[PDB]
Structures are given as C-alpha cells and as structure tokens.
Design an enzyme around this catalytic site. Sequence first.
Site, PDB file in Angstrom:
ATOM      1  N   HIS A  67       5.093  -3.243  -5.328  1.00  0.00           N
ATOM      2  CA  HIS A  67       5.787  -3.836  -4.268  1.00  0.00           C
ATOM      3  C   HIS A  67       7.339  -3.589  -3.917  1.00  0.00           C
ATOM      4  O   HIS A  67       8.045  -3.602  -4.975  1.00  0.00           O
ATOM      5  CB  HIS A  67       5.932  -5.438  -4.685  1.00  0.00           C
ATOM      6  N   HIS A  89      20.576  -2.592 -10.018  1.00  0.00           N
ATOM      7  CA  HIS A  89      20.406  -2.548  -8.585  1.00  0.00           C
ATOM      8  C   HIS A  89      20.671  -0.898  -8.453  1.00  0.00           C
ATOM      9  O   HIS A  89      21.468  -0.301  -9.041  1.00  0.00           O
ATOM     10  CB  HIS A  89      20.990  -3.290  -7.541  1.00  0.00           C
ATOM     11  N   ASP A 119       0.881  -1.240   0.071  1.00  0.00           N
ATOM     12  CA  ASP A 119      -0.027  -0.018   0.150  1.00  0.00           C
ATOM     13  C   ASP A 119       0.932   1.252  -0.112  1.00  0.00           C
ATOM     14  O   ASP A 119       2.070   1.193  -0.259  1.00  0.00           O
ATOM     15  CB  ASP A 119      -0.953  -0.075   1.082  1.00  0.00           C
ATOM     16  N   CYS A 156       4.159   1.111   1.731  1.00  0.00           N
ATOM     17  CA  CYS A 156       5.255   0.126   1.675  1.00  0.00           C
ATOM     18  C   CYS A 156       6.663   0.394   1.655  1.00  0.00           C
ATOM     19  O   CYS A 156       7.366  -0.342   2.475  1.00  0.00           O
ATOM     20  CB  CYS A 156       4.982  -0.568   0.200  1.00  0.00           C
TER      21      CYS A 156
END
Lengths: 238, 150
Positions: A230, A208, A48, A51
């Site tokens: 996410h 990354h 949400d 997060c």
Amino acid sequence: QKSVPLVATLAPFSILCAEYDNETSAAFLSKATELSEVYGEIRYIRGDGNCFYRAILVGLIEIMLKDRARLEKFIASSRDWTRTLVELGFPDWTCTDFCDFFIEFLEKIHSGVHTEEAVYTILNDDGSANYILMFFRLITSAFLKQNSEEYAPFIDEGMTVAQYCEQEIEPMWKDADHLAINSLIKAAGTRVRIEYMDRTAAPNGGWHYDIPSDDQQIAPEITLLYRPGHYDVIYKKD
Amino acid sequence: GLPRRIIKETQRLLAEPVPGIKAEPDESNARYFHVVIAGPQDSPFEGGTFKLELFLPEEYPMAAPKVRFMTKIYHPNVDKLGRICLDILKDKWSPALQIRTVLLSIQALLSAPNPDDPLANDVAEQWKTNEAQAIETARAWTRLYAMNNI
C-alpha cells in the site's frame, strides 16, 4: 482489496488500525499512534501495480484543485512533455492521445466546469483513470530517456535505459521500483515525503524519505504512507 | 460505436498494410481481425501462409490484443493452442504499442526463433540442442499445413 475503489474518500487517520492486513503488534500500534499526532486523515489508493503512480497523481490533482496558478503551470508543462515525447521517439499518435486526454481534463478543472466531486468520479472510472495514469507512466519513461546518461549506472547489468523503460515503466500494472519513484517525482516537478510504518522498508533507512533528495528546507507537498502492499495519501493536521 | 482509437488503427492498417502481412476486420465484429502472415524469405517457414486471429478486448488499449495462430506451425514461441510467447502480449504490453507493433513482432519471430525464452518448452529445447532437426520439422510442417490452406 476485493471491494475497493481506485481512490477512496477521506477517512480519519485513526481508522488505519482497523484494517485487517496490518501487523498485529504493539510496535505497529505505537507507530500509528505517533503518526496520528501529526496526520489527521488518510485516503486509500487501490494497492495494485499502479498504486504509486495513482497516489502521486491524486496528490498532485489535489494541489491543483486549490491553486489555479499552479494548475496553469502544470498544464503548460504537461503540454511540453507532449512535445518531448515526440522528440524522444515515442510512438507519436498513440502517446499524444493520452497526453491530450489528460490535458483536456486539467483544462476543464481550470475552466471551473468540474467540481471537486466530478473530479473524484473521473479518478474512479477505470477508463478515464487509467488513461490519466498512463500519461504519468509516459513522462516517467521520457524523463529517464532524456537523462539516460545520468541514470544508466542504476540499471541492471543486462539492459539499456530504453529497455528498462519499455519493460518496467511503460506497461500498465508494473509496480514502480526506487528509480521509477524518483523519476516520476522529478518528471512531475513535485516533492514527496513517504512515511514508513516499518523503517526496514525505507530506501534511505529512515522513518521518512523525502524525494527528491535536496537538502533544501522546502516542505513536501504530497505525503504518503507506505505499508506492505500500500501507498496511501496522508494529510497533516491543520 | 467503437472507440476512436480502434477506428483510427483500422483505417491506418487498411491504408498502410504491414509488408508481408494481410490484416482485415471481420464484417460482423469490428474488434475481430483476420490475419495472414507470409513465411519470411530465408526462414524455415518460407513458402507458407499462416492464418492468425486477433481480437481487441473491451479494455483495449489498456490490455493487449488476444492473438493466436490458426495454422499449425513448429516454432519455439508458438504452443499447441496457437498462443504466442511474446512479452508484449502479456505483462509488457503498453498502451503506447498498437496492432501494427504486434504484427511486426510476430513476423520478426518467424525470422528469428527465440528458444532462449525463460518459459522452457520441449520445442524450444529441441531448437536449442538439435537445431538441424527442428528446422527440418519446421520446413515439413510448412509444407503439410501452411501451403494448401487459405
């Protein structure tokens, strides 16, 4: 995300591909395969508007559970943020409540009274977990306000740093943008690597992204995986 | 019993009221506040007394107080249900803010009607394009609805 806890239990990294929201592609499969050579486990964080803050606080608390010396230092710096909030003109008592709640929680870990299991229960109780998360929004805002001259160039044409904080950092459920992400990590005094499933999403255009941008050889102490919707915590194989 | 946060806010509101605003908890429901805001001097609402209801939901301070005007008012930020177009009552609420912040913000809106709020509506459009007429209507509504109430 209907059923999901704020902070999941540890799962093997291989089960990441079982999630139905993942892109149905050999490209996703291949990248997950590569990552599975490095990372053994994944801990899902509710996706949400909170997060990113939640993934970072989970990663931090996990470090503290294994190192009391670090935990002592972190408690001291959290107490000092409490002082700094008042100095920067944050509403005194409402903000101090969140600081006090979070510090009491850390002090109970430090005392040895909380087991690992007790901590994960607290981090999954909406009331307690969101009080704790609010402390992290507050120090992120404080960091920006304290360094306002330095970060003003990055704020959209319309607004001041203080307005940006009031609108985009202080409210609960406001997703962290690139600046918020950088500010939180600096405020919390940590070092994070974010691995991307899709390099297009990376702010630095890399597979990354290490925050803060140091150039110094120091391993990140929290690693996250980003997929659309996410940020999850991931753990290197021993 | 009530959370310590609500007890403290209630005590502070009663000890130090916001100037021009009455706010008191209901005797049956301590999360429910009866509010009266005086129409500010020099505004189109001068002379009026405006009744509002305010409620603190179970998740407060993680979500904003629920608020509505009970007295009719002609204002670009107040709709037919009495709901107030204020970002801090919606997605920009922060647990750092409090009931006093909300009361002050609503009072400020009465002194400085904002018709430029992205959420366009017919009343705001009239305040923009025909401010003279909008103010006249606001004054007439003040006399009609906000004077022989309370």
